[PDB]
UniProtKB/Swiss-Prot annotation:
Source superkingdom: Eukaryota
Native species: Cryphonectria parasitica
Name of the protein: Endothiapepsin
Sorted UniProt keywords: Aspartyl protease, Disulfide bond, Hydrolase, Protease, Signal, Zymogen
Disulfide bonds: C255-C290
EC number(s) given by UniProt: 3.4.23.22
UniProt keyword Signal, yes or no: yes
Active site (record annotation): D35, S199
Lineage per the UniProt record: Eukaryota, Fungi, Dikarya, Ascomycota, Pezizomycotina
Domain Peptidase A1: from-to ranges: 17-328
GO biological process: proteolysis
Ranges that cross the membrane: none
Length: 330
């Protein structure tokens, strides 16, 4: 089997991407944030505290003939941005772009933190990291990809995120028309439960490539590119007027600037992030100070190849017995 679904930016900045997901019988379609940095599939629901729902579409298990309470199971998750959610668990039928899993754990939110409530466009998350990170207790549950894998034509999914435009998540096949050149594959460590790999270096604009190992995670659920302070300083030093602002919470730059590109290495191959991808617009409405799309990972504890990086590539998440990551230009 295979699946193919379009993923769409939630706003004009590509702050996140939503992909329609069918849950239950008859189908209830929710727009979920596919997140390769976590491993819970959770949804706004009929059980969510009413004051914490503001415009999201909810899953109502009582209206699904295939929903079953997973007795005794609870979940609770916290994300790198400080947000969180928790609740109980059902199993139900879940389909993504024509690909169907029966008995998928659907984690129903009883509580969500303010940032989720405040984002009316995201109805929940669909985790695509390794199932060892799944928070369900006392019986850990598998991700949608883990459950589908055996049935897939090939044990892979691909992320093809757009810049200010829709893109695609495919399951079970590699669309050879979706990228240019060849796909370069690179080793993955699953020891922290992430799609963790090592970039071979970087360049700023038309500058020379610096060969240096940068361990990080491929994370579709993180908006920006978080890299070591040395790398980030080298980038922003090329932008007149750019500075790190403690009050804003990262590097800012004059909105009048033209940003240089940023290149990262994948083995001997190179992925180029155009400068425009690194512009996240005014820090506040009407400001001429703009927020940077490359930020320091210092104090995160891990480097994160978020959407800023991933959307410059066609990315293969290879879930073979020994997982690997592939990157191609597009």
């Amino acid at each position: 089997s295979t699946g193919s679904a379009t993923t769409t930016p939630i706003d004009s900045l590509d702050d996140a991407y939503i992909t329609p997901v069918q849950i239950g019988t008859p189908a209830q379609t929710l727009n979920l944030d596919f997140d390769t940095g976590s491993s819970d599939l959770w949804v706004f629901s009929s059980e969510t505290t009413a004051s914490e729902v503001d415009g999201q579409t909810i899953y109502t298990p009582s209206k699904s003939t295939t929903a079953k309470l997973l007795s005794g199971a609870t979940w609770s998750i916290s994300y790198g941005d400080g947000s969180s959610s928790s609740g109980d668990v059902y199993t139900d039928t879940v389909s993504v772009g024509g690909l169907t899993v029966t008995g998928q754990a659907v984690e129903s939110a009883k509580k969500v933190s303010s940032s989720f409530t405040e984002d009316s466009t995201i109805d929940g998350l669909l985790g695509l990291a390794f199932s060892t990170l799944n928070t369900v207790s006392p019986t850990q549950q598998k991700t949608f990809f883990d459950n589908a894998k055996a049935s897939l034509d090939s044990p892979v999914f691909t992320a093809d995120l757009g810049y200010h435009a829709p893109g695609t998540y495919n399951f079970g096949f590699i669309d050879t028309t979706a990228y240019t050149g060849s796909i370069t594959y690179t080793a993955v460590s699953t020891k922290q439960g992430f799609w963790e790999w090592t970039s071979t270096g970087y360049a700023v604009g038309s500058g020379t490539f610096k060969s240096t190992s940068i361990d990080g995670i491929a994370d579709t659920g993180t908006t920006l590119l978080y890299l070591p302070a040395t790398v980030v300083s080298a980038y922003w030093a090329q932008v007149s007027g750019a500075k790190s602002s403690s009050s804003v919470g990262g590097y800012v730059f004059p909105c009048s600037a033209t940003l240089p590109s940023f290149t990262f290495g994948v083995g001997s191959a190179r992925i180029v992030i155009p400068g425009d991808y690194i512009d996240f617009g005014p820090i506040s409405t009407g400001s001429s100070s703009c927020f940077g799309g490359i930020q320091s990972s210092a104090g995160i504890g891990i480097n994160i190849f978020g959407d800023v990086a991933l959307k410059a590539a066609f990315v293969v998440f290879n879930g073979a017995t020994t997982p690997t990551l592939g990157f191609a230009s597009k």
